């Protein structure tokens with residue numbers, strides 16, 4: 064029993080991290096096969112970041128301007144191109160530790176593990192969720208740019224996030240591995256606004272099911288509710304509206320606990336209106352939305368990977 | 370900026386996990402050099418666990434009774450011995466992926482990463498703390514026995530914990546890598562009581578310093594206090610007493626924030642007496658004690674490892 068914010072094992076990703084240097088700037092890159100992926104603003108100086116013309120800047124760079132180190136093994140850049148907001152440095156040596164991998168663009172509310180890196184070397188691993196406003200609430204210092212987010216599906220590493228910037232508000236923004244930002248952000252040092260952040264309701268419900276699995280049942284209500292009446296309460300409290308697809312996803316958790324999804328929603332409705340009154344659920348005094356229904360099934364059933 | 374419950378990268382440990390089978394029982398083992406370490410109750414059946422005589426049980430087992438698999442590579446057991454509560458299975462093949470490692474016995478209040486495993490295969494990684502009553506509040510299912518806790522000190526993996534059992538109360542107990550239990554527990558299926566659990570005060574203070582580093586300063590008091598007057602308040606609320614060694618450890622955090630340790634204690638005193646009044650600190654509505662002063666310095670300065 065028990066429940067923890069659990070990350071994926073990072074071994075397969077550690078052997079793909081390299082440091083990329085272009086002039087004075089050094090950040091992390093992802094070395095898969097004979098291509099190194101990294102944020103394109105590595106070609107910028109501190110002055111260029113206020114209003115960078117990436118095409119013009121990249122023209123003044125040639126293959127020998129980029130320095131890729133994989134520990135004490137230096138790679139030679141043989142070609143370079145710009146795909147959206149990432150640079151693709153084609154190198155001579157293919158990574159011998161390349162795992163079976165895939166590039167994926169996740170949807171808001173999904174979770175993934177982050178391997179925070181500095182100078183190409185891993186520092187730590189943690190789990191987080193893509194917020195509905197396409198930011199993440201991470202833990203990043205200067206030089207962490209190019210650190211990647213990922214999931215593991217059996218033997219396959221699914222890369223879904225590359226870190227690019229910290230907003231003036233202290234939250235974090237990045238791209239998929241094809242260089243398309245999550246959200247409306249641009250890789251430029253200017254004031255940028257993230258939308259209103261909401262709570263991922265389907266995740267909160269999954270977490271309440273995890274609490275029931277672990278013996279925390281005090282919030283279980285003697286009432287029920289309707290999908291429309293719940294959504295009317297949820298939207299007052301800045302919660303994501305619940306759809307039928309969400310009910311379908313929670314089905315397995317309903318069957319294991321014998322508690323119908325709508326009855327769980329009624330318990331959530333009371334928690335929203337009356338608070339938690341100094342009590343706790345699974346050790347927390349707040350409603351938690353960083354666990355997807357699949358995360359809960361994974362942890363409470365013991366799924367492993369290669 | 371930002372702050373997350375961050376685990377160590379697990380790659381060095383993943384290549385050491387193997388599955389150990391003795392008769393019907395299968396659990397995880399740790400393969401370092403030509404020795405496999407695992408909980409000794411792998412030699413028990415479900416009936417033996419109520420009152421096991423481990424010496425008599427081990428006598429009825431020979432080297433060929435143990436089946437060690439490292440993926441699809443079967444190891445041959447050439448010798449076996451019992452060191453306290455762990456079994457040491459000497460095998461023919463030395464682990465080629467053996468990292469520079471060390472066996473350490475941590476003290477209560479220290480933190481470490483857990484690589485939860487099933488059938489010798491990693492499932493996930495999370496960070497936790499050794500409680501003052503020598504339990505851990507983990508996330509473990511049946512068959513996770515033999516999963517290890519560890520820290521990384523540059524290139525050296527420091528193994529400090531091997532998981533053995535879940536108590537009837539739902540918390541977890543285990544040994545160091547020499548087989549000595551943390552706490553007063555025995556590897557037997559009987560009702561066992563853990564002591565009163567207290568809060569690790571030096572950790573709570575480190576976390577408040579992390580909050581100040583990250584812009585959360587509302588709890589900062591216009592008062593001060595004495596070490597004795599604080600300890601008198603802390604012991605009422607089941608907090609560990611603060612000593613001068615704790616003040617010395619927090620010194621670097623004091624210098625970076627310009628807030629003296631005793632002034633921070635005064636802020637903590639008010640939080641204990643008046644609660645948090647629906648507010649939050651670093652995203653939490655409770656005082657957090659699973660971050661050591663070194664954890665905070667590591668995360669807020671960006672320490673990396675090989």
Ligand SMILES: O=C(Cc1cccc(Cl)c1)Nc1cncc2ccccc12
Pocket residue numbers: 104112203204205206207208227228229230249250251252253370
């Ligand atoms: O924000 C940047 C650089 C940048 C600036 C503007 C635009 C773009 Cl694209 C990138 N780096 C950082 C990323 N994470 C965390 C950081 C913490 C402290 C300082 C910088 C941090």
Ligand SMILES: O=C(Cc1cccc(Cl)c1)Nc1cncc2ccccc12
Pocket residue numbers: 064410418509510511512513514533534535536555556557558559
């Ligand atoms: O508790 C045991 C076996 C055991 C029993 C008595 C004494 C000893 Cl030494 C070991 N296994 C488990 C360890 N962690 C988590 C578990 C979750 C569910 C079931 C068993 C779990």
